[PDB]
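can u pls check wat happens w/ TT3
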Amino acid sequence: EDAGLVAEAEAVAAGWMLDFLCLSLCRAFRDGRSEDFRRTRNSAEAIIHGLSSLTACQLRTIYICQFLTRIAAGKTERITPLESALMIWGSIEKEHDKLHEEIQNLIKIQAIAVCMENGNFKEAEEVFERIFPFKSKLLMIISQKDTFHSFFQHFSYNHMMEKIKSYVNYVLSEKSSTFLMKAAAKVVESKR
Amino acid sequence: EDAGLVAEAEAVAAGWMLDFLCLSLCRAFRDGRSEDFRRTRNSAEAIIHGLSSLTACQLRTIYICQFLTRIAAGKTERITPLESALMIWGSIEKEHDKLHEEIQNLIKIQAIAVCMENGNFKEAEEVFERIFPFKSKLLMIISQKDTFHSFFQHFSYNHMMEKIKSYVNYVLSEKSSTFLMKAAAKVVESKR
Ligand SMILES: CN(C)C(=O)COc1cccc(F)c1
Ligand SMILES: CN(C)C(=O)COc1cccc(F)c1
Ligand SMILES: CN(C)C(=O)COc1cccc(F)c1
Ligand SMILES: CN(C)C(=O)COc1cccc(F)c1
């Protein structure tokens, strides 16, 4: 009847569910399974409410989940989903390697380009102002509605998604051996 | 890279999380930990969305969670929370023993009495009409605003909560050895 030991067991189990749901979210994002992504995101968000003290590893896990959530809502606070993804990306405790900078740059341009794709050019300019010769050339492209300019074709949505999926594959392999998924695959392999 | 085996592992893990969250919900309800109950309920509801095919045991688990959720919202569809708890209680695949009938009767009267406690006597009559010499005596009590009649004092909110908590203790012991909580308590005992 020890309430403290029970709360401790509940916190250990919340940590296991968090890693399992991050793994599931990464796979759904990689596979393009939108409805499964939406369901796993709702589950991860609820499970995270059962945690009040997080380790550095757990903080990185929750911010990766938040970041992918903004990326998945990219084509849909007073900022756009892709602007929110950029704020999380720039503050996650991670190495600022070549891949990090590539994703950062692709998000910055796509935060503008998704507004143009949606036909909201005033919003495209407001996004540009909040993020940013280069600047005056990018603002002229938005102003001229030059949505299919070679610059936008190189810093494309598909290229942003491909680079982010490559990062998702590293998270997926770094968490492939976490307790809950490993025990669950063991049960499935035993059946069989 | 087998998507089917991964989805199978995700379903096995959803089953484990469901039993763990039912256990956690039962403890919070027994302890009167309202905020913890609200958080565990949100988590259970989200996790249950990741399941599309349930066994008879899993159906009983989800309906116990739904039932306690209605009981916890009892003093707050075109029916009241306690009327919804009654519909679930009468349809759960379980034995209709003495305890089942006691809980059923206490809920039926409290579904009326919580409306009187809230000062909504028109709603108390509408609840009576939907659920129901005995009937004409119960309707006269509502009509006379006889909230503290000896009948209401014997079929009280506290007596309803005590009887439901006794049932919760049976669910709690029947699920005490489920995979996730057992593995989590093992980690906690190892630290100590
Ligand atoms: C701060 N908010 C409201 C969010 O970022 C919601 O998104 C989330 C949150 C946690 C996990 C997840 F998978 C998604
Ligand atoms: C001289 N300057 C500022 C440049 O040519 C950099 O261009 C870029 C390209 C992509 C993203 C970005 F945010 C900036
Ligand atoms: C049918 N609805 C919307 C509900 O009953 C919500 O309540 C729930 C649902 C599942 C688990 C739980 F713990 C609570
Ligand atoms: C002759 N009759 C109908 C009775 O005296 C039963 O009284 C009850 C008592 C509690 C709950 C309930 F629903 C009914």
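The radius of gyration of chain A is 19 Å.
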